[PDB]
Design a protein around this ligand. Structure first.
Ligand SMILES: CC(C)CN(C[C@@H](O)[C@H](Cc1cc(F)cc(F)c1)NC(=O)O[C@H]1CCO[C@H]2OCC[C@H]21)S(=O)(=O)c1ccc2nc(NC(C)C)sc2c1
Lengths: 99, 99
């Protein structure tokens, strides 16, 4: 699809058997999901944004279906206030910016 | 231009007579710029991101030239680590997401 930006670019995703909404975020290097129960093993990690840092659990090779497109990659889980799809997954669904 | 997301989507901007680099950020409602000398009046404001909140100064009706496209709107100034062009200005230059 083509998505204009008059509203937040929110898409339906499916990950770890659950349905969620997430923001398509070109300013996010990585994918950060709010607290949720993922199956695999994880690694502790800290990541930085506007107001400082948050600790997250890093899961690798996680499968996500973003608006009907499948992708596998790293997912970070922790106290983000918004589910964010970052560029590590946007490149897999072929996402681009156009103006 | 069409911009793929294999690297950060950085653009050159001109704002307040100064040249800066800034991120095209579909996950940002608003435009927030690192500390810089801007002329005019401003309202104190507090915005939230991944690690908490930051106080910024809010300037309205500010001219920005973004990759050669002119836009006018609200610019927030404060302790962001990267300059972010948010959706309030992205819509003005016709920017869309495509996949
Ligand atoms: C700041 C930017 C450079 C990175 N930010 C992505 C932005 O899109 C966030 C996304 C968001 C939306 C949201 F609604 C709430 C949030 F809390 C966060 N927007 C945002 O802060 O917007 C603020 C201000 C503009 O107005 C409003 O917009 C909505 C809220 C206000 S990040 O989330 O901090 C992030 C993500 C991934 C990531 N991966 C890493 N890798 C490491 C290894 C280096 S570092 C890193 C950091």
């Amino acid at each position: 699809p083509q998505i204009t930006l008059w509203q937040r670019p929110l898409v339906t995703i499916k990950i770890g058997g659950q349905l969620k909404e997430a923001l398509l975020d070109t300013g996010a290097d990585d994918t950060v999901l709010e607290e949720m129960s993922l199956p695999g093993r994880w690694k502790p990690k800290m990541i930085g944004g506007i107001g400082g840092f948050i600790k997250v659990r890093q899961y690798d090779q996680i499968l996500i279906e973003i608006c009907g497109h499948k992708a596998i990659g790293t997912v970070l889980v922790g106290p983000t206030p918004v589910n964010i799809i970052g560029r590590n997954l946007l490149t897999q669904i072929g996402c681009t910016l156009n103006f």
